[PDB]
């Protein structure tokens, strides 16, 4: 539903996940946010 769509969109843009798991301009990231 909405949550599934929201999580998928964030994952596509790399918003969710880890910084430490092992298997961009900040303005550009802001553009990615606004689109979401």
């Amino acid at each position: 539903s909405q949550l599934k769509n929201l999580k998928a969109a964030l994952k596509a843009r790399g918003l969710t996940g880890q910084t430490n798991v092992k298997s961009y301009d900040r303005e550009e990231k802001k553009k990615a946010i606004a689109e979401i």
Binding site: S1, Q2, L3, N5, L6, L10, L15, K29, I33
Partner: protein, 219 residues
């Protein structure tokens, strides 16, 4: 502090709610009842065809229900929302403005019905705290910390904006998506008793013809 009527069961007994409508509801009002059921986790929608207020309240009180929600409309436009708390009140009446149903959104999807987080803002006056206490106790207690659903009541000039959002915790920020509905609810009357008892004392009422009504604040 929690009100005396709710203090006995505050955080002890999970609220039991019945959502209903006036006689001969329109399709939109019947729709509008549906998300109000979905809004409150422990709500049950009941078809009111020919039910009588003494009969309705008496039957509800027997079943052990906590609160009763009744909806009124005007040409399929939701207009009023009255919440009555058993066994002896209080009864709070509201007017719905700029009502926006989820049926108005295409490809909307399904809701999540976890115990939602609650947000009450700009409630400072004593009457405001009473409104928080009444609304606060419709929902289940102890929402899960990772519960993904948040309901917000924002007080802006006596008009309580109601929204429903689902979030996600990202690395640099949290992004919320509203699920709907949107509606602004204004308290205009409050009684110390069940909705059936028309003679119950009025704790508070909205004076609209006083000269300062145009600029007056209450919540």
């Amino acid at each position: 502090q929690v009100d005396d009527e709710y203090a006995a069961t505050s955080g002890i007994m999970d609220p039991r709610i019945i959502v209903t409508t006036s006689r001969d509801p329109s399709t939109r009002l019947s729709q509008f009842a549906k998300e109000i059921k979905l809004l409150f986790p422990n709500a049950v929608r009941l078809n009111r065809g020919n039910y009588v207020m003494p009969n309705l309240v008496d039957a509800c009180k027997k079943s052990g229900t906590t609160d009763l929600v009744v909806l009124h409309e005007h040409r399929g436009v939701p207009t009023s929302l009255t919440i009555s708390h058993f066994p002896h009140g209080p009864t709070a009446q509201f007017s719905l403005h700029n009502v926006v149903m989820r049926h108005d959104i295409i490809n909307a999807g399904n809701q999540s019905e976890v115990n939602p987080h609650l947000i009450f803002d700009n409630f400072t006056t004593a009457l405001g705290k009473r409104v928080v206490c009444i609304l606060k106790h419709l929902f289940n207690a102890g929402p899960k910390k990772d519960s993904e659903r948040v309901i917000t009541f924002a007080n802006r000039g006596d008009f309580i904006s109601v929204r429903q959002h689902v979030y996600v915790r990202t690395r640099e920020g949290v992004e919320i998506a509203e699920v709907g509905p949107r509606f602004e609810m204004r308290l205009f009357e409050l009684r110390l008793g069940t909705l059936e008892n028309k003679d119950a004392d009025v704790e508070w009422q909205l004076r609209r013809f006083i000269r300062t009504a145009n600029k007056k604040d209450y919540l």
